[PDB]
Write a protein that binds this ligand. Structure first.
Ligand SMILES: O=C(O)c1cc(C(=O)O)c2c(n1)C(=O)C(=O)c1cc(C(=O)O)[nH]c1-2
Ligand SMILES: [Ca+2]
Ligand SMILES: [Ca+2]
Ligand SMILES: [Ca+2]
Ligand SMILES: [Ca+2]
Ligand SMILES: [Ca+2]
Ligand SMILES: [Ca+2]
Lengths: 448, 452
């Protein structure tokens, strides 16, 4: 899709909704869920706290604090994945993922672990931790970490590309396209588990019906992803996803078994438009600079591959891009002054939520996907047809404010939306400029 | 997708198949089907002839000639739709569509109508009889007729009817109706002027399915709207509906047809990307002396209103699964390598059909879940892979069978190791070197390709 302008974003104020702050003292609130007890459960990424909030009254309790979570102030690591077992009353388990030190490792001292806890209703806390899958890659960037349980009773988990080929990890070779050998797998070497959607058995083992990649069945379900922070099943069992792109081409994807989503060789569609793959790990010197022009303009010494020059297999294009631009696009927009990036043709989607409606369903919102935006301070509404096979029309912005929206859910009746906002960071103002003064830092807000 | 180069097309020779020309110099052969009798049945658009050909011998019989078909030598009209009833053994019916004179026409420039008609096949006398009109009074013109007719798993007729060529060439100043739908009044009067640029869904007797989608509070024969020239339409084994469609100077499409979807034409070509196309509405131009610069709306002469794809306010827009091809605004539509015939260098392939490859006991290795899309201007047949659920394409459109021919239609035998193809009798095609030729290697042919 074509980028909206600052003026278009500015007008998306959603005055048909009443706003109320439920909680405002949260630290890096990250995921929120409508729990089996009709309470809202949410996570704090850096503290590792799991909170439970009464949706009506706003009363809150800290149910548990995951010990030894590691978080960098300048990082995206910490407590990430969070889901309930679908038959909680009979299987009182909570599944998480988190950043923990890797005793087996200075560069990348940590690992990601997918862990199960048992909920004890009488004492109201979590106990009997079980590591389901450990030794997963960890870094400060592009961790993704959405964890959901599908209709098939398997765990689906997004694990980002770890930031390879950008900023602090510029010279590390991106592994989004790589898959494990049977040896690696046999040795629990999950280095290639970067830029993937994993599909695991509830005990962390490999599903016998997982797809085969380069001749091996591993935990990998799909590959070729950058930073997919949104993952959500539809009522008819399809799997929708949102994913952050570089300077362009954030994506809404339909996840299909064995698909290759193209990163880093392809951003968005395979169109050779506004992006090219500049592989710094293959560069001459590690002194070469990244001009940060999305591969369209690069310094000498770095090999560039056009999207159309890639020789990949099973490439699956996005349902929608937010956004795609042409090669004439100027990635250095003066409007954003110092924080040049905020003006890039992206929205920085932080999650993806399938709106299920209910007795008070919002008129016209049938079959919509809600996608919060960090940098634009809006929640997008994206309509799909009734079979969730295609998007209809464009991504419609809502709730414009000077806030970084991190996650969103709706009440069972469907007339109230609950959102999390970041504690700190940059956001685009109504006038297109940048501010780090957030209106509702680290909050749980409801829109009725 | 990004356009292939002349060198990439030239390499796609398909050395893994044996080629045998069964017939040549047919008169505008258009559609072909694997017959209920295991013979090849094919139509001649110009003559209205329905031919049956034997595979070993190439023996041909004119089974029937649809009377009074109207065809212009310089047009795309004539005998179009062609399908058998799915349970032919118990329902020996053949369904066609064709161009016929419209006695009720109030306009000399558009004297004809399209009629969807059923015939009964008589095995005893080996002919067609008892004609029954199912739907008459449909739009007709010399351009963008489309006319693919298939019967779905739901036992309904699905029919593509093109935008009639409005907003280009000889019909430049006529207002395109692809986005328009009938009022209840027009429907009551059987005024089907808005049945342009649509996929229609009809009951087997021609009536309106009560479960058709509603457009502006009216349920008509329209199933989807916003199409230009969709010549390909085919159901998948899991009941999904795939389609190929010709775009203007860019953005030919492979679409997934969903009930009530709006495919965007003419406001949007391919993706809604403002890239390489804009909607220049000549019917709204200041006067009829204005020229079409033929730069796909990116550059236009003064006096014609232009709307960007992103400025359109239509609803239920469905983007293509794949574009052949998409380019940027800087693209040069006046490519000198095609000389006095600039258009065959445009970033399109001119898809003429769409066929779902079903395999069989001798299925071709790697061709599972593929869609075969013949190209008129490039002289190739594309193979497009989809996942096993036919939810997305995988990779790109792979060219095959490169030759100086205009490929019109393609099917496979039940065993799946043989392809049968039709080629045009005349027209332009791109040569291996990228230049244009009107010397076709196999004019008006039925060609067999057998996997080695
Ligand atoms: O293109 C951008 O403008 C931009 C902005 C941001 C952001 O504002 O946080 C992120 C990203 N990109 C980036 O692609 C990304 O993966 C990312 C992760 C996060 C986060 O806070 O978790 N923000 C961002
Ligand atoms: Ca980005
Ligand atoms: Ca992708
Ligand atoms: Ca791209
Ligand atoms: Ca064309
Ligand atoms: Ca279209
Ligand atoms: Ca377009």
């Amino acid at each position: 899709d074509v980028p909206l302008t600052p003026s278009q974003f500015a007008k998306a104020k959603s005055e048909n909704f009443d706003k109320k702050v439920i909680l405002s003292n949260l630290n890096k609130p990250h995921a929120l869920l409508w729990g089996p007890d009709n309470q809202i459960w949410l996570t704090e990424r850096a503290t590792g706290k799991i909170l439970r909030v009464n949706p009506e009254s706003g009363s809150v309790k800290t149910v548990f604090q995951v010990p030894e979570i590691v978080n960098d102030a300048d990082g995206q690591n910490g407590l990430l994945g969070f889901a309930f077992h679908p038959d909680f009353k009979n299987n009182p388990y909570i599944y998480i993922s988190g950043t923990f030190k890797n005793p087996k490792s200075k560069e990348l001292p940590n690992q990601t672990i997918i862990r199960r806890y048992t909920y004890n209703k009488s004492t109201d806390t979590l106990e009997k931790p079980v590591d389901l899958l450990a030794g997963l890659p960890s870094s400060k960037d592009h961790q993704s970490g959405r964890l959901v349980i599908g209709p098939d009773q398997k765990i689906y988990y997004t694990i980002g590309d770890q930031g390879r080929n950008q900023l602090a990890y510029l010279f590390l070779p991106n592994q989004a396209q790589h898959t494990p050998t049977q040896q690696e797998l046999n040795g629990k070497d999950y280095h290639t588990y970067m830029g993937k959607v994993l599909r695991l058995n509830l005990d962390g083992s490999i599903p016998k019906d997982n797809p085969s990649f380069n001749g091996v069945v591993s935990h990998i379900y799909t590959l070729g992803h950058r930073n997919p922070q949104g993952l959500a099943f539809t009522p008819n069992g399809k799997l929708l996803q949102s994913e952050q792109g570089p300077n362009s081409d954030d994506e809404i994807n339909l996840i299909v078994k064995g698909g290759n989503y193209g990163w880093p060789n392809v951003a968005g569609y395979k169109d050779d438009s506004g992006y090219a793959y500049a592989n710094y790990s293959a560069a001459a010197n590690k002194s070469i600079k990244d001009l940060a022009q999305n591969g369209v303009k690069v310094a000498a010494g770095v090999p560039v591959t056009k999207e159309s020059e890639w020789t990949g297999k099973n490439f699956v294009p996005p349902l929608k891009t937010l956004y795609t631009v042409q090669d004439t696009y100027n990635y250095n927009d003066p409007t954003c002054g110092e924080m040049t990036y905020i003006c890039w043709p992206t929205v920085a989607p932080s999650s993806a939520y399938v709106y299920k409606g209910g007795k008070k369903a919002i008129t016209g919102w049938e079959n919509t996907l809600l996608v919060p935006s960090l940098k634009r301070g809006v929640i997008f509404r994206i309509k799909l047809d009734p079979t969730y096979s295609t998007t209809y029309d464009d991504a419609v912005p809502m709730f414009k404010s000077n806030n970084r929206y991190r996650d969103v859910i709706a009440s069972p009746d469907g007339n109230v939306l609950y959102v999390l906002t970041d504690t700190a960071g940059n956001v685009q103002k109504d006038d297109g400029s940048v501010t780090n003064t957030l209106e509702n830092p680290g909050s749980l807000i409801k829109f009725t």
